[PDB]
């Protein structure tokens, strides 16, 4: 309270000034190269901002970076705070049309390309950054007050057309300055994993960079028992963010891929206590927090340190509000909820809040209002979550009333994605699911209509993130004797070689899907592949890699002949 105020929080760019001036020698950045300090990592980012500022010398412009995480990605991060702009990620894994939309709606002036690969850019005014010029020798930086835009974030999309939610300076440093619920030191090693897209990924690089520690980027490839415990072991990460189905995953595959963690967060979705507490009990030191948050409110709302007691429950607590903000539980009236185990909608305060929606004003009036909180009236988001309180006065999650999914930690309105296959032409109807198999989730989809009029089209047009797994055509969406579709009938309706049929009795049971002669438009994604890989590394295998034998390989044809090439089809059932 009064920390709910946004001006009692620093510039990330003042903070992270600070603590390069504190701590020149500090590792700031670890990769496959090497380290830079925090002198080096001022240097070069103040070097690109004197470029930045060549070009946009008015505060305020959106400007992009693409490329995985490497040392000119962060650098370029930092150089476009320095000038007092705000950073958009373009996902170049991503179709056109989306990207120039993201574009379109922030105005994004420029991106700045550290892809290390050739950028098929083709529409969108793309510059290298590696080797550039070194421009004019020096700027003064504009001296910005914290309510300035750092960078943004786009609503799920699923209408086709996504929002941007600007987050602002103080929204970061608010995340990252006085908090309990993790211990931010210079000692720090921070896993830069999350995709920059979303709001993970502030956590994982400010809270190294805003208190002295250290960015361990994974340039090693998509992340998994391996490649996890090579960022630890080589490269010394204590800390990280995981979101809760990876977090399922690796803990299935190898809980100790886990060892060497100092602290843990998980969150995105509603964690699995099974998996949470293998973790646990395999490191009973292991500072584990269950982090909660909508992007409106800029990464996290409410965090809990989890405890011994809470493996008993039904469900992890989400705990309480961070430094910075402040969280009310509303009844259907609009009065606050002051008593456990009665369930009301959860509402957001303090320095976290978001802009807006950008280019929305219906949304934005609907979820950020006025409230009043304590005395005084402040401004609020509705988050739109249902919890509850406990005996202790925790916060425990119960879900939503309206049609939104969390998808592997990925934000989708459904209703408005179903509606958008329902508008496809020869479609009569749409029926989209999320599964809970494995720890993780699919997203499946049936639709009735015409047998040539698969939404290929719409399919390319789609984010990745936002594609169904498995696309089946049916005879009708089964209808219960109350008009409501039947999920269980659905997912029910849902369910040859040597060794050609042996593969496709393992994809079935592991994907819940169908046999006959493709893995990802049979219901695989990218962490059911992981697992599917692992199993075929546990059979006399490692050669066969995340890359060579699915997605190379994807058809069973190509697989049956990829398994058959080393190993046999059953032997994979019991490992
Ligand atoms: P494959 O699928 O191709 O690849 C696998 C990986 C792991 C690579 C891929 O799936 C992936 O990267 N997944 C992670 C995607 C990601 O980085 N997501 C961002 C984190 S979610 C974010 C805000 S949000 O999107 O708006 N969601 C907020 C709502 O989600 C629910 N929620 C959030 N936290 C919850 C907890 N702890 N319990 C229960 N529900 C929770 C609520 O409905 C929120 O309103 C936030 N900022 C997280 C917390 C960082």
Same mark, same amino acid.
């Given at each position: 309270?009064?920390?709910?105020?946004?001006?009692?929080?620093?510039?990330?760019?003042?903070?992270?000034?600070?603590?390069?001036?504190?701590?020149?020698?500090?590792?700031?950045?670890?990769?496959?190269?090497?380290?830079?300090?925090?002198?080096?990592?001022?240097?070069?980012?103040?070097?690109? #901002?004197?470029?930045?500022?060549?070009?946009? =010398?008015?505060?305020? *412009?959106?400007?992009?970076?693409?490329?995985?995480?490497?040392?000119? #990605?962060?650098?370029?991060?930092?150089?476009?705070?320095?000038?007092?702009?705000?950073?958009?990620?373009?996902?170049?894994?991503? =179709?056109?049309?989306?990207?120039?939309?993201?574009?379109?709606?922030?105005?994004?002036?420029?991106?700045?390309?550290?892809?290390?690969?050739?950028?098929? !850019?083709?529409?969108?005014?793309?510059?290298?950054?590696?080797?550039? =010029?070194?421009?004019?020798?020096?700027?003064?930086?504009?001296?910005?007050?914290?309510?300035?835009?750092?960078?943004?974030?786009?609503?799920?999309?699923?209408?086709?057309?996504?929002?941007?939610?600007?987050?602002?300076?103080?929204?970061?440093?608010?995340?990252?300055?006085?908090?309990?619920?993790?211990?931010?030191?210079?000692?720090?090693?921070?896993?830069?994993?999350?995709?920059?897209?979303? +709001?993970?990924?502030?956590?994982?690089?400010?809270?190294?960079?805003?208190?002295?520690?250290?960015?361990?980027?994974?340039?090693? @490839?998509?992340? +998994?028992?391996?490649?996890?415990?090579?960022?630890?072991?080589?490269?010394?990460?204590?800390?990280?963010?995981?979101?809760?189905?990876?977090?399922?995953?690796?803990? &299935?595959?190898?809980?100790?891929?886990?060892? /060497?963690?100092?602290?843990?967060?998980?969150?995105? &979705?509603?964690?699995?206590?099974?998996?949470?507490?293998?973790?646990?009990?395999?490191? =009973?030191?292991?500072?584990?927090?269950? @982090?909660?948050? %909508?992007?409106?409110?800029?990464?996290?709302?409410?965090?809990?340190?989890?405890?011994? +007691?809470?493996?008993?429950?039904?469900?992890?607590?989400?705990?309480?509000?961070?430094?910075?903000?402040?969280?009310?539980?509303?009844?259907?009236?609009?009065?606050?909820? !002051?008593?456990?185990?009665?369930?009301?909608?959860?509402?957001?305060?303090?320095?976290?809040?978001?802009?807006?929606?950008?280019?929305?004003?219906?949304?934005?009036?609907?979820?950020?209002?006025?409230? %009043?909180?304590?005395?005084?009236?402040?401004?609020?988001?509705?988050?739109?979550?249902?919890?509850?309180?406990?005996?202790?006065?925790?916060?425990?999650?119960?879900?939503?009333?309206?049609?939104?999914?969390?998808?592997?930690?990925?934000?989708?309105?459904?209703?408005?994605?179903?509606?958008?296959?329902?508008?496809?032409? /020869?479609?009569? &109807?749409?029926?989209?699911?999320?599964?809970?198999?494995?720890? *993780?989730?699919?997203?499946?989809?049936?639709?009735? /209509?015409?047998?040539?009029?698969?939404?290929?089209?719409?399919?390319?047009?789609?984010?990745?993130?936002?594609?169904?797994?498995?696309?089946?055509?049916?005879?009708?969406?089964?209808?219960?004797?109350?008009?409501?579709?039947?999920?269980?009938?659905?997912?029910?309706?849902?369910?040859?070689?040597?060794?050609?049929?042996?593969?496709?009795?393992?994809?079935?049971?592991?994907?819940?899907?169908?046999?006959?002669?493709?893995?990802?438009?049979?219901? @695989?994604?990218?962490?059911?592949?992981?697992?599917?890989?692992?199993?075929?590394?546990?059979?006399?295998?490692?050669?066969?890699?995340?890359?060579?034998?699915?997605?190379?390989?994807?058809?069973?044809?190509?697989?049956?002949?990829?398994?058959?090439?080393?190993?046999?089809?059953?032997?994979?059932?019991?490992?």
């Amino acid at each position: 309270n009064s920390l709910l105020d946004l001006y009692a929080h620093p510039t990330v760019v003042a903070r992270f000034s600070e603590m390069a001036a504190l701590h020149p020698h500090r590792e700031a950045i670890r990769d496959r190269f090497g380290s830079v300090d925090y002198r080096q990592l001022l240097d070069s980012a103040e070097q690109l #901002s004197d470029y930045l500022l060549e070009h946009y =010398p008015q505060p305020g *412009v959106c400007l992009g970076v693409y490329g995985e995480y490497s040392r000119e #990605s962060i650098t370029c991060l930092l150089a476009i705070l320095l000038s007092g702009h705000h950073y958009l990620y373009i996902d170049l894994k991503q =179709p056109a049309a989306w990207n120039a939309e993201l574009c379109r709606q922030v105005d994004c002036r420029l991106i700045l390309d550290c892809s290390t690969t050739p950028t098929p !850019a083709n529409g969108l005014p793309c510059v290298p950054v590696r080797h550039l =010029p070194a421009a004019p020798a020096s700027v003064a930086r504009p001296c910005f007050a914290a309510d300035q835009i750092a960078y943004i974030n786009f609503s799920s999309g699923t209408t086709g057309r996504p929002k941007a939610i600007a987050c602002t300076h103080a929204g970061i440093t608010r995340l990252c300055l006085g908090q309990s619920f993790l211990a931010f030191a210079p000692q720090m090693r921070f896993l830069v994993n999350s995709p920059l897209s979303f +709001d993970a990924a502030t956590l994982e690089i400010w809270g190294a960079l805003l208190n002295g520690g250290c960015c361990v980027l994974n340039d090693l @490839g998509p992340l +998994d028992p391996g490649v996890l415990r090579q960022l630890i072991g080589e490269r010394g990460a204590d800390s990280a963010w995981l979101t809760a189905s990876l977090f399922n995953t690796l803990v &299935d595959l190898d809980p100790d891929c886990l060892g /060497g963690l100092r602290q843990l967060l998980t969150g995105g &979705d509603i964690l699995s206590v099974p998996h949470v507490r293998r973790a646990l009990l395999r490191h =009973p030191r292991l500072h584990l927090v269950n @982090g909660y948050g %909508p992007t409106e409110n800029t990464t996290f709302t409410c965090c809990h340190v989890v405890t011994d +007691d809470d493996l008993e429950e039904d469900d992890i607590p989400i705990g309480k509000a961070i430094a910075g903000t402040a969280v009310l539980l509303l009844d259907e009236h609009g009065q606050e909820i !002051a008593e456990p185990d009665r369930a009301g909608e959860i509402v957001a305060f303090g320095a976290g809040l978001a802009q807006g929606y950008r280019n929305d004003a219906a949304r934005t009036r609907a979820s950020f209002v006025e409230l %009043p909180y304590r005395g005084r009236l402040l401004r609020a988001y509705r988050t739109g979550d249902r919890a509850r309180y406990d005996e202790q006065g925790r916060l425990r999650f119960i879900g939503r009333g309206d049609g939104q999914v969390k998808l592997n930690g990925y934000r989708l309105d459904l209703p408005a994605l179903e509606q958008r296959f329902r508008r496809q032409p /020869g479609i009569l &109807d749409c029926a989209l699911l999320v599964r809970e198999r494995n720890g *993780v989730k699919q997203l499946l989809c049936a639709w009735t /209509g015409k047998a040539d009029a698969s939404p290929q089209a719409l399919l390319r047009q789609l984010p990745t993130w936002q594609r169904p797994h498995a696309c089946v055509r049916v005879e009708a969406l089964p209808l219960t004797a109350h008009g409501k579709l039947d999920r269980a009938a659905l997912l029910r309706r849902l369910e040859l070689d040597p060794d050609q049929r042996g593969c496709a009795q393992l994809w079935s049971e592991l994907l819940g899907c169908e046999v006959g002669a493709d893995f990802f438009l049979c219901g @695989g994604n990218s962490l059911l592949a992981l697992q599917l890989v692992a199993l075929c590394q546990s059979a006399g295998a490692g050669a066969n890699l995340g890359l060579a034998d699915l997605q190379a390989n994807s058809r069973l044809d190509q697989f049956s002949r990829l398994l058959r090439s080393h190993g046999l089809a059953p032997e994979r059932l019991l490992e």
